[PDB]
Design a protein around this motif. Structure first.
Motif, PDB file in Angstrom:
ATOM      1  N   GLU A  18       0.566  -1.220   0.205  1.00  0.00           N
ATOM      2  CA  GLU A  18       0.228  -0.374   0.024  1.00  0.00           C
ATOM      3  C   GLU A  18       0.974   1.368   0.202  1.00  0.00           C
ATOM      4  N   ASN A  19       2.000   1.204   0.940  1.00  0.00           N
ATOM      5  CA  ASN A  19       2.383   2.417   1.029  1.00  0.00           C
ATOM      6  C   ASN A  19       3.570   2.832   0.153  1.00  0.00           C
ATOM      7  N   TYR A  20       3.674   1.776  -1.094  1.00  0.00           N
ATOM      8  CA  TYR A  20       4.734   2.206  -2.603  1.00  0.00           C
ATOM      9  C   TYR A  20       4.175   3.135  -3.515  1.00  0.00           C
ATOM     10  N   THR A  21       4.838   3.618  -3.771  1.00  0.00           N
ATOM     11  CA  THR A  21       4.799   5.140  -4.793  1.00  0.00           C
ATOM     12  C   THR A  21       5.720   5.054  -6.185  1.00  0.00           C
TER      13      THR A  21
ATOM     14  N   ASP B  90       8.047  -0.733  -1.441  1.00  0.00           N
ATOM     15  CA  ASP B  90       7.622  -1.094  -0.606  1.00  0.00           C
ATOM     16  C   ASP B  90       7.173  -2.286  -1.446  1.00  0.00           C
TER      17      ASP B  90
END
Ligand SMILES: Nc1nc2c(ncn2[C@@H]2O[C@H](COP(=O)(O)OP(=O)(O)OP(=O)(O)O)[C@@H](O)[C@H]2O)c(=O)[nH]1
Ligand SMILES: [Mg+2]
Lengths: 111, 111, 74, 77, 852
Positions: free
Chosen positions: E408-411, E417
RNA sequence: CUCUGGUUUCUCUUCAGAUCGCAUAAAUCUUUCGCCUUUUACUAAAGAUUUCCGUGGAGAGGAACAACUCUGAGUCUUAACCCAAUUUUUUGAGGCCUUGCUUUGGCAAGGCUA
């Protein structure tokens, strides 16, 4: 076909009647095996009753729970019949008597 | 042999009406909420008594609440009290209100 | 049974009609019946010569309908 | 209602090939198949008797004037 | 594959063939109120397609509710997926991916998880109870999640065998239920193209117990099958809705002849059903043979020897056949999902539909980049390894193929993440058995093994060395807020690691569970309610960690707010003694927090539209309306951050330079809070002044953020602080007599009865009330045991309200174990939660001020 | 249109952890705490074994009347009257000429017709 007949409400009520009155077939139990007041003492005690009957309710519940908790499945037998063996023997014979007559007979025999 | 039977619905209706005086006219088991064999098993296991229920000897050697020695967990100075936790709450939700729930039975929810 | 052909989708659309005899006409669907007989408006005969001639509103018997193709999007 | 007809309706939504009574060959997606074999199809490739091809978006062929249809093998099982 | 499977009417080879064609798929979610028949309906479908499996006569098989806790309690606890090949009324076959969800209002997280990967919703409504709390909430949730909704009115036999209403009144009841549903849908959805009515085909009628399921179309098909000269489509088009039949002319009219004729529905559908049921249950021995002869049903003597309930099930099954109306409804009124992909990507995907991957996925072709999305995590019976259950929106999953899992924290900037994993095996999960496969194309639900390690709640799976511009799907937005809170500890501290492992596993299992460690080394768990937490503890104690655990008494989580602007404008200075900030705090206007939370506003909006909304609605001057900087702890929080510093006093370029640091400090401070370290709600923080140091190494980083948080704390403390309580909304369903008892029980616990009404057509009443969450504990058992079981209640979090007392008062004296009266509940809660967290004994409004 | 399978009753052999029993006893052993001083838990819990009161299923034998309802199977819509202009027992798609192609045979196009 008529929407309803004279025995429609009766069937609908039987749908919700308690066991065994919701059945239409089954097996035959034993007079011993039929308890009449188990449903009576499984319920909440009616309000405004004396302490002795309240505790009687509670103790009947206690023993009912104990039996239900300690029950174990029955074991496997070979179905040997004592009275069948007796009848097979030559020392016994069959007959039909009034129950009170047999009761007096067995009282005398035990004496 | 008098082993099995199969009656007609009018017969069943008449027999039900005659037996009416021995039946409680209950249509659901909601009456027995926290008053069924499972609730009684749970109360026995947790060593507690439902107000109207039986009362047995402790199944396991009871833990004395005067033995625990005021850890950070059981610090009474952090608790917020609104309503006392009656035995019924613990019987209804055994795993959320008890410590060491052993041989505890889950009670059927609403029907 | 006595079914309708499923042609409501094609109503009031321009169509290309292949008929038996190697015959081809084009026009707007104005209606139909269970035999697949059609009413076609502003109909044009596409002669084998390549020449096209306006015949107006016509009846095509479903019997002699080989194939139809929409010239529109349904 | 016939057994083959049920199997045809099963092919709705699949790519099928159709030959007419006149031997024109139409391949594309079967949208609707009626009981009488009337066939609505889309995004067609048509191969005429001379061999030439064409492309059509939307077609509808009368059941009577169909000689046969080829259906996927996805159905055979 | 080749594994062993139970005998089926269809074949797994045909199922595999179908999965490739994404036009004959249907992703459906069965949802509805508690105990409304969803599980038995699904089980009857399974029975239809699997002749060997059956539902017992006296006992009802489920084939969901597999868990031991589910079986004992009788309430569905976890959503269950099924994949079947159902035949349509026309004789065609489709593939149905049916996610059956639980009903209890506490497990709405399961419903949300199902909706995320579903494309259509089937709402199950009981015929007697009608619309209820969870049905309302689920209609809201579905129309907000942008799904196509259809309705199945279940338990229609309660109108015949329990209420025994006349056919016309039964029709009126069904019409009223439909009207309620339509009203709710119109309320919660602006678009009016979505109207529910049996004429269109959006509503089906079912009695799952006795295996009845039909739509007007299916019943007209039965009529046509008996007499072969009618178009069942037209017949169904004419049956329902105030169309009186006329037999002299054999035509249907909107005008009633004889002023006594029954509607076509009552005449053709309802009345013969009444007749069949009455004949089976009342005259099984006199005229039932004749009635069956008329209907054409022929059943053996052993079959007619059965008892009334099994005999009814059998006769109804013989008369009706398969559940073709359900398939008709779903096929006609749910996307393909090739059609429904576009709204799905538009709503969920964070990268936007316009993106190139957005288009590639909206196409939804099996040949493309891999963009699987996993929302559920199902544990094996041994409880060691979790399998990720999700949907494939593009490409094709292959067994053994390495994949890239993004959390979820991946950007696109912080690409840490993610992790490269190796998928082990694939399954097409039928409820109780998993058909192992070797590949799965786009547009299907899949169980995946070997990707569980790097993900906690939700994740997206793509392919390495492709899709460099890949972004995660939005994390689940939940229908409620988890408020109830408990603390946990092992009995023997030597077994702490086992407890930690169990905590991690339950955190994975329960979508909306939140486990955390407080400053004082206390392991806290947040749950929705009593039954939710009881199930969580049972799982943690028996399934995952095999140790014994002490649990603290339940408590709730509070918030902190202000009721009036700060007494004085406060300030702080960085340790460098440059970079001074000066703020004030005040309360927001009514409803603005609700707007922010419910997304009526979005900080992502262009400043033009944002200022327009703020000016027009809440009477804000455009100058301030165009000065918004942040929206509380999250992008959507109930607190706002504005800056009133005129450009004449400060440099706007410099303020823009330090904007990010100030905003980070503000968000952290709002998240924590000074009073008891809990969220701050409904507050406006206005930066009145700021003197910024010139050099970037003099400002930024560790200088501004702590200073910004300290200034936020000081302003909040200066403003009159108060605590905020959570309030549950209770809805009791009690007999007409026990309303007074419900009133008494509620009055005992600070409750407040908003309303109490009857249920039209039913002998019961619904009482709606509000109850403080902290006092709600044990309320339902209190009610049930006092009423003798005739009264039942469900409670759900509704809103936040201010606690009666004043928190920052030191005059009050709290005894350790006494229920405090109302006026200092705030002080009691504040001090005791401070002790729990492990902070100082109390807080002084000058604690964070720099002067002292 | 025909051929199996029947029902009741008496007894024997064997399997059954299925609420074998929609009810419920007793004995022994072990542990636990009771309370203990010598013997002795009705008023107490857990576990294990055993014995009694009762069932099912299957197989075997006997003896009493019904023999085709039902279970199926052999045997799969047999026929009286009326019918086909989109999907086969009525279908008017019938012919010829020229040109081109092709090793010829053979194939494609147009026109003529009544
Ligand atoms: N009278 C009647 N009762 C039904 C019918 N269908 C289900 N029920 C009863 O309703 C209750 C709920 O059963 P389920 O359908 O398994 O419960 P559910 O739909 O899964 O709802 P959850 O427990 O929240 O998952 C059961 O006690 C069923 O006996 C019906 O058609 N008629
Ligand atoms: Mg369920």
């Amino acid at each position: 076909t008529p929407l309803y007949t004279d025995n429609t409400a009766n069937g609908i009520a039987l749908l919700w009647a308690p066991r065994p009155f919701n059945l239409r077939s089954g097996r035959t139990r034993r007079a011993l095996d039929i308890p009449l007041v188990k449903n009576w003492y499984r319920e909440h005690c009616p309000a405004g009753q004396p302490v002795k009957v309240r505790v009687s309710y509670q103790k009947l519940l206690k023993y009912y729970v104990l039996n239900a908790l300690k029950h174990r499945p029955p074991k496997a037998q070979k179905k040997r019949y004592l009275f069948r063996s007796f009848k097979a023997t030559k020392f016994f014979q069959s007959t039909k008597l009034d129950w009170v007559e047999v009761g007096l007979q067995v009282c005398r025999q035990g004496y | 042999t008098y082993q099995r039977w199969q009656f007609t619905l009018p017969m069943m209706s008449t027999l039900y009406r005659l037996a009416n005086q021995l039946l409680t006219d209950l249509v659901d088991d909601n009456y027995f909420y926290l008053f069924d064999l499972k609730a009684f098993f749970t109360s026995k296991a947790l060593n507690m008594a439902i107000p109207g229920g039986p009362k047995f000897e402790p199944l396991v050697r009871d833990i004395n609440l005067q033995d625990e020695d005021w850890n950070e967990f059981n610090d009474i100075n952090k608790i917020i009290i609104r309503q006392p936790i009656r035995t019924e709450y613990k019987i209804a939700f055994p795993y959320l209100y008890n410590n060491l729930p052993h041989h505890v039975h889950l009670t059927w929810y609403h029907t | 049974k006595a079914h309708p052909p499923e042609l409501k989708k094609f109503m009031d659309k321009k169509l290309s009609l292949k008929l038996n005899g190697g015959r081809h006409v084009q026009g707007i669907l104005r209606g139909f019946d269970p035999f697949m007989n059609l009413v076609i408006d502003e109909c044009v005969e596409m002669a084998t010569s390549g020449q096209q001639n306006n015949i107006g509103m016509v009846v095509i018997r479903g019997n002699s309908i080989i194939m139809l193709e929409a010239l529109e999007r349904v | 209602i016939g057994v083959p007809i049920k199997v045809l309706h099963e092919a709705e939504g699949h790519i099928v090939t159709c030959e007419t009574n006149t031997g024109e060959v139409y391949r594309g997606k079967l949208i609707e198949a009626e009981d009488n074999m009337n066939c609505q199809m889309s995004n067609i490739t048509v191969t005429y008797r001379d061999g030439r091809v064409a492309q059509l978006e939307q077609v509808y062929i009368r059941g009577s004037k169909i000689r046969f249809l080829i259906l996927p093998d996805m159905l055979k099982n | 594959m080749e594994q062993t499977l139970p005998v089926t009417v269809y074949e797994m080879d045909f199922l595999a063939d179908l999965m490739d064609n994404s036009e004959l798929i249907r992703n459906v979610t069965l949802c509805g109120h508690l105990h409304h028949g969803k599980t038995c309906f699904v089980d009857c479908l399974i029975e239809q397609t699997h002749p060997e499996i059956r539902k017992r006569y006296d006992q009802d098989l489920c084939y969901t509710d597999i868990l031991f806790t589910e079986q004992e309690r009788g309430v569905g606890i976890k959503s269950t997926p099924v994949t079947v090949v159902l035949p349509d009324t026309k004789g065609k076959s489709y593939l149905f991916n049916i996610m059956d969800t639980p009903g209890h209002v506490n497990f709405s997280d399961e419903v949300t998880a199902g909706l995320r990967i579903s494309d259509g919703v089937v709402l199950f409504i009981d015929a007697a109870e009608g619309v209820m709390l969870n049905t309302e909430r689920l209609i809201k949730h579905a129309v907000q999640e942008r799904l196509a909704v259809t309705v199945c009115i279940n338990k229609i036999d309660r109108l015949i065998l329990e209420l025994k209403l006349p056919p016309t009144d039964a029709y009126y009841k069904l019409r009223h239920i439909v009207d309620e549903v339509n009203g709710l849908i119109s309320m919660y959805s602006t678009d009016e193209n979505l109207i529910l009515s049996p004429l269109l085909g959006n509503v089906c009628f079912s009695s799952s117990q006795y295996s009845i399921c039909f739509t007007l179309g299916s019943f007209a098909k039965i009529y046509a099958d008996t007499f072969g000269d009618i178009n069942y489509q037209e017949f169904a088009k004419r049956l329902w809705g105030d169309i009186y039949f006329n037999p002299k002319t054999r035509k249907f009219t909107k005008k009633a002849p004889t002023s006594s004729s029954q509607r076509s529905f009552v005449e053709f559908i309802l009345e013969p059903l009444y007749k069949i049921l009455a004949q089976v249950v009342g005259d099984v021995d006199t005229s039932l043979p004749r009635t069956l002869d008329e209907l054409g049903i022929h059943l053996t003597k052993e079959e007619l020897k059965l008892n009334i309930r099994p005999l009814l099930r059998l006769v109804c099954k013989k008369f009706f056949g398969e559940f073709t109306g359900f398939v008709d409804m779903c096929v006609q009124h749910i996307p393909s999902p090739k059609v429904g992909a576009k709204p799905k990507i538009e709503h969920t995907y964070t990268g936007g539909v316009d993106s190139d991957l957005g288009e590639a996925m909206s196409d939804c072709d099996p040949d493309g980049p891999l963009m699987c999305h996993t929302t559920k995590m199902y544990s094996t019976d041994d409880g060691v390894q979790f399998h990720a259950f999700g949907r494939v929106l593009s490409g094709t999953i292959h067994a053994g193929q390495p994949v890239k899992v993004l959390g979820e924290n991946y950007t696109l900037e912080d690409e840490e993440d993610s992790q490269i994993c190796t998928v082990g095996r694939l399954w097409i999960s039928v409820a109780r058995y998993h058909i192992e496969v070797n590949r799965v194309p786009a547009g299907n639900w899949v169980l995946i093994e070997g990707v569980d390690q790097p993900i906690v709640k939700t994740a997206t799976i793509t392919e390495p060395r492709g899709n460099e511009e890949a972004q995660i799907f939005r994390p689940l937005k939940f229908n409620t807020t988890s408020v109830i809170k408990i603390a946990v500890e092992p009995v023997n501290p030597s077994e702490l690691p086992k407890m930690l492992d169990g905590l991690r596993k339950v955190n994975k299992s329960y979508p909306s569970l939140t486990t955390k460690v407080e400053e004082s080394g206390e392991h806290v768990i947040l749950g929705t309610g009593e039954l939710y937490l009881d199930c969580v503890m049972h799982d943690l104690r028996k399934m995952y960690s095999e140790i014994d655990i002490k649990v603290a008494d339940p408590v709730v989580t509070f918030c902190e707010t202000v009721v009036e602007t700060s007494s004085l404008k406060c300030f702080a200075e960085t340790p460098n003694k440059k970079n001074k900030i000066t703020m004030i705090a005040e309360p927001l206007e009514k409803g603005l927090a609700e707007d922010i939370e419910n997304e009526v506003v979005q900080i992502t909006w262009n400043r033009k539209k944002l200022g327009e909304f703020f000016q027009t609605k809440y009477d804000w001057d455009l100058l301030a309306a165009r000065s918004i900087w942040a929206f509380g702890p999250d992008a959507t929080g109930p607190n706002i951050l504005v800056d009133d510093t005129l450009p004449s006093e400060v440099d706007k370029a410099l303020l823009g330079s330090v904007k990010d640091s100030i905003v980070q400090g503000f968000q952290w401070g709002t998240r924590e809070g000074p009073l008891c370290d809990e969220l701050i709600r409904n507050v406006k923080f206005k930066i009145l002044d700021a003197v910024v140091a010139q050099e970037p190494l003099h400002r930024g980083g560790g200088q501004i953020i702590p200073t910004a948080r300290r200034v936020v704390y000081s302003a909040f403390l200066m403003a009159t602080p108060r605590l905020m309580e959570p309030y549950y909304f209770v809805e009791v369903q009690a007999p007409a007599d026990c309303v007074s008892a419900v009133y008494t029980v509620l009055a005992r616990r600070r409750g407040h009865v908003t309303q109490d009404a009857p249920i039209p057509g039913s002998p019961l009443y619904t009482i709606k009330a509000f109850i403080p969450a902290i006092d709600s504990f044990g309320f339902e058992t209190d009610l049930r045991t006092h009423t003798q079981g005739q009264a039942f209640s469900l409670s759900v979090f509704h809103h936040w309200q201010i606690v009666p007392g004043d928190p920052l008062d030191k005059s009050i004296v709290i005894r350790p174990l006494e229920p405090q009266p109302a006026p200092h509940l705030a002080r009691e809660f504040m001090i005791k939660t401070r002790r729990r967290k492990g902070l100082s004994e109390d807080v002084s409004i000058s604690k964070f001020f720099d002067d002292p």
